[PDB]
Design a protein around this ligand. Sequence first.
Ligand code: HEC
Ligand code: HEC
Ligand code: HEC
Ligand code: HEC
Length: 90
Amino acid sequence: DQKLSDFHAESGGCESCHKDGTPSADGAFEFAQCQSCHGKLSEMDAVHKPHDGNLVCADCHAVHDMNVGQKPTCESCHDDGRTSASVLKK
Ligand code: HEC
Ligand code: HEC
Ligand code: HEC
Ligand code: HEC
């Protein structure tokens, strides 16, 4: 296993996401960095799209905590048992 943060740091350092390699308080800088490479939520799949304007990437992708390949789940914010699968293949 590799954390997602470590995977990215191999290709650009901690500074790929963080000013001077140091986290911001707000997370806005980091969100802007994610979007600079990956684009906007509105241009992503059905899991991503309805979160445009209400979440930042880090609200689901806890890049230091989560392995490469590990999918965020949904129960922290929704109470119906939805999954990425139940929405992608709605
Ligand atoms: C983007 C893919 C990242 C890479 C590369 C690294 N980090 Fe990160 N880290 C990222 C986010 C989105 C966040 C949360 C939001 C924010 O404001 O940063 C974090 C958080 C941290 C923190 C914790 C901050 C806090 O608790 O106050 C630290 C200390 C941190 N990140 C350090 C760090 C280092 C040393 C990295 C290189 C090895 C590194 N991060 C890479 C996203 C990303
Ligand atoms: C450009 C310098 C990037 C920044 C900044 C961030 N990401 Fe990234 N990410 C980038 C590449 C080139 C790749 C590899 C291709 C791939 O899609 O694997 C990635 C990968 C991810 C992944 C994994 C996707 C997968 O293969 O299943 C995720 C989930 C991801 N990146 C998320 C993400 C977030 C939340 C960021 C900000 C905290 C972020 N990336 C920054 C390039 C770049
Ligand atoms: C929770 C509502 C999420 C937010 C906000 C973001 N992502 Fe996400 N991402 C999430 C899941 C559950 C998954 C796996 C299922 C899927 O829809 O593919 C992903 C996956 C990605 C990937 C890989 C996509 C692929 O085609 O394999 C990437 C690169 C990714 N996510 C990046 C990403 C970025 C950069 C975000 C902010 C703009 C972002 N995600 C938000 C869940 C959630
Ligand atoms: C909190 C940090 C969230 C997580 C984790 C996930 N979602 Fe979410 N979602 C969130 C907000 C703030 C909103 C805006 C509307 C609302 O519920 O208040 C959404 C919206 C959706 C939607 C649109 C339909 C609806 O329920 O309103 C979908 C289809 C959706 N979210 C799916 C989804 C999935 C599949 C998640 C797990 C991968 C997920 N969300 C996580 C906040 C948050």
